[PDB]
Each structure stands twice: as structure tokens, then as C-alpha cells.
Design a protein around this ligand. Structure first.
Ligand SMILES: NC(=O)C1=CN([C@@H]2O[C@H](COP(=O)(O)OP(=O)(O)OC[C@H]3O[C@@H](n4cnc5c(N)ncnc54)[C@H](OP(=O)(O)O)[C@@H]3O)[C@@H](O)[C@H]2O)C=CC1
Ligand SMILES: NC(=O)C1=CN([C@@H]2O[C@H](COP(=O)(O)OP(=O)(O)OC[C@H]3O[C@@H](n4cnc5c(N)ncnc54)[C@H](OP(=O)(O)O)[C@@H]3O)[C@@H](O)[C@H]2O)C=CC1
Lengths: 239, 243
């Protein structure tokens, strides 16, 4: 157990990347709790398969996020995975949906990270799942999403300095296409996405979890305030 | 008049960088409207001096921002300048203050830009005042502010592609230290800031306005989705170890 005896909280752990992260930390021996909102059956099934603890918390509710983090006690590792996509022509998207995206994708990582730092010991780790779309030229239809993922860069740089004296690192993982419900490897966008990539496949959720596990471990104590891209070199058109 | 016959709306134009932008567009012949929230006397003095129109609108109120942009009619140029700073140790800052910063610095530029594109013609221009702190390693105590300024980068890149078919460009201007009420050139941080710079002075609000004016003009129709830094090369500490 690389993480035996460690307390891990994963926000948004019921499916996809988050569920892969739950499984990895469980396999490595950690005491894992994770949150869900809309996928209760998936959460219960994951808890039964792994022994992790499922907890309802809507990441769009600031005080609920703060409360779940605070009521976890001293955390060793916080992973903020929960995020949503609202895609379409900017002039046709509903403003309330956009603001919900900002609340989940920007506000919740900020407040969860600060709250976690209140009780986290020296050696603590905070990981946020961002996106390579925080760096790249976004396709049409994802401007607010891209903004929310670029927000995490300045957020992590700044919080790294706020948390440095406490012995806590904070880092952002930026995936390219990963095979999940939100980005199925078999979906109709498969061929286009792969035409933009050096490694012509979707990543697997377990690969994101592997990068998270390295950053959360003892070899990464000098790694903080940084964005770590795991994307198959996405963004160049096949010629 | 480089901007004669153009209609300009500046969100947050009562003081500082915003006020310099109002003055520049007025001097260049535009019909200028600008918003204010807390500085009514400054706004009324600026309107009297320039002839620009001062309009109350609180940028923390999404529907009010959308409404002032919408009721402006077909804009030629939108400048989103309004922004706030909330600084201090992250574990001591009030959560409602942080969320207000997000609402002004992130939500408002997005909704204002989208609303402006509804009636803006081909050749239109949208400019957002970001910060070099969207790129640089932030000092302690401005993590949320830095996040709000980095948010604008993905925002502008994405909206550039949404707005491309409409003939509208969108760009972010990223200033370094500029002499304003929020960052006075004679303030106690002067020497430290200049110790981090190649050009050892605060910028003037008029210089930010000059960069905005070039980007808003007809020579910049191929310039969109980009971040334009005007910072005196901020971010490297003065030393003499290479002598
Ligand atoms: N797949 C990809 O290609 C990429 C993904 N990402 C990022 O990875 C992260 C995970 O993505 P992915 O696994 O594909 O997403 P999925 O949509 O497959 O999974 C989303 C997960 O986030 C949780 N979640 C969503 N909203 C909330 C909320 N309000 N409160 C609590 N939990 C919530 C969901 O739980 P529930 O269903 O219970 O609500 C679910 O477990 C996101 O931040 C996303 O932006 C980034 C780049 C690429
Ligand atoms: N000066 C600097 O060194 C730098 C500044 N910037 C950015 O430049 C922009 C202007 O900064 P600066 O001139 O120094 O700021 P100041 O504090 O001097 O002026 C702020 C301006 O924004 C307006 N404003 C603030 N909040 C609101 C609101 N809720 N609704 C409407 N208007 C509002 C203010 O109007 P009122 O008082 O009427 O509310 C005022 O006109 C900001 O976005 C800032 O982040 C970026 C990098 C460096």
C-alpha cells in the first residue's frame, strides 16, 4: 500500500476519471471517501466493489462542499475531480447553466482546496482535475468550459504559495480525451479527436489516476503550482 | 477621429484604466458610454469633462450587466474593464468576498461579451482588461484574483471562435503595474514592484488605453483570441550575480 493509512477525499468520484481515482487509492491502501450528486446507483455500486465510502454532496452548493471537506477532519489528500461541460453556440446557451458550470468548475475547487488546507498536515496533497482545454485553442462551443479550466492555472499557482508554508502541494492535472461517459471512445467524435493527436486513442481513466497517484506520493514534494498535461499531444491536425 | 461614428461601451469607466479608456475613445471621436457603481461623483466629473455618458450598473449583478449591454443597441466596441481585488492569506479571506470577485472578474466579462455579440456588426471589437497575473506566478494573497485573470484566457480563445463567423474580434489586454487608485505609483509597494521589472516605473492608464485603441482599430482585424501583455517585463528579481 503506497497510501496505506492515508485519508483521501475525492469530490466527484462516482463515475469516469473520479471512479478510477477512487479505485486506485483503494488499491494502494488508502481510506477513501468520495462524493456523488446525480449518480446514486453508480456510487453505491462503486462503494460495494471497493469498500470506499460514498457521500452525497452537490458541488454547485458552496457551503455543502465546504461542509463535506471540513467534516472529513484532517485529510491527507484532496482530489477535486467533479466538473461539468455545457457546450454549444455561446449565443444560444442558457446563462443559468453557464453560471452553474462556473460554480462547479471554478468556485468549488477554490473553496474545497482552501477548506482542506485548514486541517491538512505537512505533506498534504491537493490535486485538481483541469483540462488541456485550459491551454489549447478551444473548438467552437466550449468558451465557458475553457475559461473554467484556465481559471485553475492561476488558482493553483497562487494557492501553491499560500499553502507552501503549511507543507502542502497543489497541482492541476490536464487530460486530453479520456474514455468516459462524457467523452466515450466509441462516440461519433472519435475520429476527429484522434486526427488531432499524436497518440491516436482516448486515454483511460486509470492513466489519469496513475498521474494523480504519482503527484500525491512522496516523490512529488517539490512539485507544486504546476499543470501536468496527459493528452496524447492533442491539438495538431493530421497532414 | 479614428473612431468617429463608432459607438463604445466601457464597463467600469469611472476611474483609473477605465477612465483613461473613456478619455481616449472620446478624444478619438467615438460616442462613448461607461458604467460605474461605487464612484458616482468621479463618474459625473468624467462625464462632464468628456461628454461621455455615465450609467450606473453593478458588474456583480449578471442581469444588470446583460441589460446595460443589451440596451446599448448595436455596439461597435465593448471594453470590459471593471475588476476587483481581494487580497490576503487564502485561509483568512471571506468566502462571499471571493465569490463577488469571481462574479465581477469572471462571470461579468463572459455574459457582457456574449450579450454584446448579439447586436454587434461585422468589424466589431470586444476587449477585456485582464492582468499579467493571469500568466505569472502570483505572490501570496491573490490566488482567487489570479484565477479570475487566467479564466479570461480560455474565455477569449473560445469566444474568438464563437464570434469569428460574426466578424467580431475579442482580445485580452494584460497590464503589469499601472498607476491607479488600486496600485498607486507612490504607494509602499513601489520599490519591490520596480525591483521585479525591466522598465522600472508604473505604467500609465493612458498606455493601457493606447494598446486598447490599437486593438479596437481597423489594423487589428486579424488579431483575435490573443493575450496582449503591457507590463514592463514584470517578474524577474533584480540582482548582480552575473557581474
Ligand atoms: N473525459 C475527458 O475527456 C476529460 C475530462 N476532463 C475533466 O475530468 C473531470 C471528470 O470528467 P469525466 O470523468 O469525463 O466526467 P463524467 O461526466 O464521466 O463524470 C463526472 C463526475 O463528476 C461528478 N460530478 C459532476 N457534477 C457534480 C456535482 N455538482 N457535484 C458532485 N459531483 C459531480 C459526477 O458525479 P454524479 O454523476 O454523481 O453527479 C461524476 O462522478 C471533469 O472535471 C472534466 O472536466 C478534462 C479533460 C478531458
Ligand atoms: N492597476 C494595475 O496595476 C492593474 C490593473 N488591472 C486591471 O485593470 C482593471 C482596472 O484596474 P484599476 O484601474 O487599477 O482599478 P481601480 O480600482 O482604480 O478602478 C476600478 C474601476 O472598475 C470599476 N468597477 C469596479 N467594480 C465594479 C462593479 N462591481 N461594477 C461596475 N464597475 C466597477 C470602478 O468603478 P466604481 O468605483 O464606480 O465601482 C472603477 O472605475 C481591473 O480589471 C484590474 O484587475 C490589471 C493588472 C494591473
Amino acid at each position: 500500500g503506497a497510501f496505506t493509512g492515508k485519508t483521501v477525499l475525492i469530490l466527484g468520484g462516482s463515475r469516469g476519471i473520479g471512479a478510477a481515482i477512487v479505485r486506485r487509492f483503494v488499491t494502494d491502501g488508502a481510506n477513501v471517501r468520495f462524493t456523488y450528486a446525480g449518480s446514486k446507483d453508480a456510487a453505491k455500486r462503486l462503494a460495494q466493489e471497493t469498500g470506499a465510502t460514498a457521500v452525497f454532496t452537490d458541488s454547485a452548493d458552496r457551503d455543502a462542499v465546504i461542509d463535506v471537506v471540513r467534516k472529513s477532519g484532517a485529510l491527507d489528500i484532496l482530489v477535486v475531480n467533479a466538473g461539468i461541460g455545457v457546450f454549444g453556440e455561446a449565443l444560444e446557451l442558457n446563462a443559468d447553466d453557464i453560471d452553474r458550470l462556473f460554480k462547479i468548475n471554478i468556485h468549488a475547487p477554490y473553496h474545497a482546496s482552501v477548506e482542506a488546507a485548514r486541517q491538512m498536515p505537512e505533506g498534504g496533497r491537493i490535486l485538481i482535475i483541469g483540462s488541456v482545454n485550459g491551454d489549447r485553442m478551444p473548438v467552437a462551443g466550449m468558451a465557458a468550459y475553457a475559461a473554467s479550466k484556465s481559471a485553475l492555472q492561476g488558482m493553483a499557482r497562487g494557492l501553491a504559495r499560500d499553502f507552501g508554508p503549511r507543507g502542502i502541494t497543489i497541482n492541476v492535472v490536464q487530460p486530453g480525451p479520456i474514455d468516459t461517459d462524457a467523452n466515450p471512445a466509441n462516440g461519433p467524435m472519435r475520429d476527429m479527436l484522434h486526427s488531432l493527436m499524436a497518440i491516436k486513442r482516448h486515454g483511460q481513466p486509470e492513466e489519469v489516476a496513475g498521474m494523480v497517484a504519482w503527484l500525491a506520493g512522496p516523490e512529488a514534494s517539490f512539485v507544486t503550482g504546476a499543470m501536468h498535461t496527459i493528452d496524447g499531444a492533442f491539438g495538431a491536425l493530421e497532414h
